[PDB]
Design a protein around this nucleic acid. Structure first.
Length: 106
RNA sequence: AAAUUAGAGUUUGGUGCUGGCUCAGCUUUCAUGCGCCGAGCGGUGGUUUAUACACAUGCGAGCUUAAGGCCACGAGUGCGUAAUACGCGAGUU
RNA sequence: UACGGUGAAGGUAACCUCUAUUGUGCACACAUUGCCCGUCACCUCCGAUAAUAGUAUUGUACAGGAAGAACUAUGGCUACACUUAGUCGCGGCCUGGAACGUAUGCGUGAUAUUAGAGUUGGAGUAAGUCGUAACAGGUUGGGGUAGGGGAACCUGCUCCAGAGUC
RNA sequence: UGCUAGGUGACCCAAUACGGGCAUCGGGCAAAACUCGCGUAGGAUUAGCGAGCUGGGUCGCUUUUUUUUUUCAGCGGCCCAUGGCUUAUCCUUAGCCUGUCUUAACGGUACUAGGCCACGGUGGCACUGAAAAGGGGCCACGGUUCUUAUGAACCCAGCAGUGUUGAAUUUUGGACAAUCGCUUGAACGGCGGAUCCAGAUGCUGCUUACAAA
RNA sequence: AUUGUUUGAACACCCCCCAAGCACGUGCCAGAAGGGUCGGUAAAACGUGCGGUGUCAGUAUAAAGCGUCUUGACUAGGCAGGCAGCGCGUCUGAGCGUGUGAACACUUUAAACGUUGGGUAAUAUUCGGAGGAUCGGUCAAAUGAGAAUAUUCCGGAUGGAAAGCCGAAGGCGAAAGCACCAACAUCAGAGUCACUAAAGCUUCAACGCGUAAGUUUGGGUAGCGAACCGGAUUAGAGACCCGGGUAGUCCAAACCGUCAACACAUUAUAGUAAUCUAUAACGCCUGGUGAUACG
């Protein structure tokens, strides 16, 4: 019709998580095991995890469950759920695998 | 006898817009936990999805009257290629 | 607390107020102690950028230039067949040179890659902090182009009224 | 050119009687190979194409073979007409189409099987063949081993299987019986990791309490 | 043909979306969540038991593709008003095209455009005279003109700015814009009356116009008004305001070309001045913060 619209229509098939790189689960080595204080109106000290991942890039990961056993040089499996209460963090450490196993009496 | 269009929550003192996020849909993985692994008949499906990475070992093209006669079909992958490609349509020296 | 005896002074200009009535503006509703501003401050996070250590690919200057080799060859060697016994051989097989043709070397270009010296920006963050941009909003602001200041910024000149309001 | 049937043999094999191979001829249909008409990812932070970049003549372009008639191309050498394109070139992504999933449809996007192309660790090249190379030939590269170091041998994008990476990837199974292919004139012959059957493993459709005839 | 009786086991969820609720536990701690979020001492979300809903040898989480999403709109968004009309024009692209567009003769139009000559209310400086302490200025205060004569006032010179009223919800323009005349001058636009029989529409690309600032060149300059020094509401004050005033505003030539350059109303045709809207070519947007750095 209008030929500008005729040329007006393959884009970037954008992975909405750009750290798993299209995959669901990538393992990695925990660089640092640390906690932080969250955005108000939350004030409970949430425990996080900076991981050197499989793809050579780094992003922060939520640590779930009643405590954990992760230290330096420790391998985990990282999942794709985010934690909302601090900005910019999109990763969840799944439990039922490696040095991070399940809590006692869940 | 032609078989053909689902929304909701989220913004604000409330109302309506404005577009975005999410959940409920279908399909999909030797995905990841937790649980069973009774036995049979089957369909099928893995692009070892990636590495066109390095391959131990064994086998995959030998047949036949020393000599000669026949073994370019099958299998795998997508490096390269944006066009002697591939598809469609006409005519062939 | 109650009940009488006497008993006057004294009054309308936003002249504050405490409203209403209202009908002109807000980005306020925790309803102007708001919404919310930035220089910065400790840190965290993808940028953007890059001297370079360079490796991966190609054009071009020439040496080359292997295996091959377009061309060139009659040095051949042999039968077919024809010569009644050396002839003959249009035609089949064989030492020969060679343009060209990789990989390759010091020059010297392209696209591409991360390593990264090193600088700066965006964003994120509960309590370090200096002033009033913004709103009747207190100098009426700004699209524009240049100046001046520890900071928010202001100085001109046409516009737009998408600030109030008679 | 390649297959199948015929017809021929001053050939070879078999034959208590006759058919095969082997050479040649020709009927049938056939592949192959080329050509052009169109389609086709984005990028101006690719704007001129560093080029014969297109055309005309001349040759070279390695065979005559049934009646009136018959045989491509810049592919190379030479002149020559000076033009040809302008999403032209250049970059980077990417095998392509049908498919499969979804949508009500138009569309949008990982497979099924299968169509075609490309490639065989990298690059160059040739023989033969009508047509060229995935376990054929030669050289150079890059790997892997060994040498008394001088040099040789090999290249799983074939099957199983090993190792890295990965969240994840299977049995070093059986078999020529069925196809189908190659081959052989006996012999239900020989071989085939094609395939057919079994495994592990996602999805599925479909049963499942024992006893007894 | 023969005979006996029967519903497992888990996983997730149970505030709303979304079917399902209570107890103790701990009280912005341990925690969960896809979103709104709940916990800040009486938790219908988090520790556990009970009870219930979904699916069932499966179930939830994670991802990925499509749809929902008209969320790139052809079916099917739009673009003053959230985000979206390029500042305007010339324009043989492509596309849409059976009376529009253009030149002539009259009627009528003015701030349309450039050049040349002349003028002006008014302006500060100056040459002599009147006159002897105020003027300037502001809500208010403060450097100075001035004991050499200030505001003023007389009359004279200077030299260029700007066109003071007209003059207005008035005109001309494509837009920016355009406001002393007189003349040259080149248009333009409207109406009448005639020619012409699509030469029409749009503008990708290109290209011009382009208020004002700013820079190069030449000078000199009524008024205007950045620096530099002086004083003020206030604690510092660099601003608002008072006080002198340089480049620039003035001219002639060039470069720049960007902007709430707005009808924020694309252009054109067809209807009665559109934001009533069918179409023709367009240009632009795709949640916010992030447009700055390279080329």
């Amino acid at each position: 019709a209008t030929v500008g619209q005729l040329l007006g229509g393959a884009k970037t098939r954008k992975c909405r998580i750009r750290q798993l790189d299209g995959s669901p689960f990538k393992k990695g080595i925990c660089l640092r095991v640390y906690t932080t204080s969250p955005k108000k109106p939350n004030s409970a000290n949430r425990k996080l995890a900076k991981v050197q991942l499989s793809n050579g890039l780094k992003a922060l990961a939520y640590i779930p469950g009643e405590g954990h056993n992760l230290q330096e040089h420790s391998m985990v499996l990282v999942s794709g759920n985010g934690v909302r209460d601090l900005p910019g963090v999109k990763l969840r450490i799944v439990r039922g695998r490696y040095d991070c196993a399940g809590v006692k009496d869940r």
